Amino acid sequence: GYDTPLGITNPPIDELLDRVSSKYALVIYAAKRARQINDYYNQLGEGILEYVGPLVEPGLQEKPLSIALREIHADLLEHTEGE
């Protein structure tokens, strides 16, 4: 219910907090997925597709972390809490 933002602030922060328990968990919850995405890109040439690539279709040469944050907003990831 507001003007669509532009830049790195999309998606917004409050929307994400509705999914994750706390902002401190979200940073890792997204960084690990970004790491998995980067690993998948590294093995794109040849290897096992165990680290499934991006779920949401990426843009034109977007950083993996942006993809992770934009797909987390879509509620497509599940995680376990501390240990």
Binding site: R35, N38, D39, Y41, N42
Partner: protein
């Protein structure tokens, strides 16, 4: 936390850390976790004296 860890370990002291992170950035590999800063190892080898 991780930002402070990098600022204190991976960009100031750790030699092998600097070499490995530079090579990883040159390639597409993820940045390896930092190591033991030279300051801590020097402090050890000095306090053991």
């Amino acid at each position: 936390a991780y930002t402070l860890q990098e600022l204190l370990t991976i960009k100031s002291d750790d030699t092998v850390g600097r070499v490995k992170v530079y090579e990883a950035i040159v390639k597409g590999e993820n940045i390896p976790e930092p190591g033991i800063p030279e300051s801590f190892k020097v402090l050890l080898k000095e306090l053991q004296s």
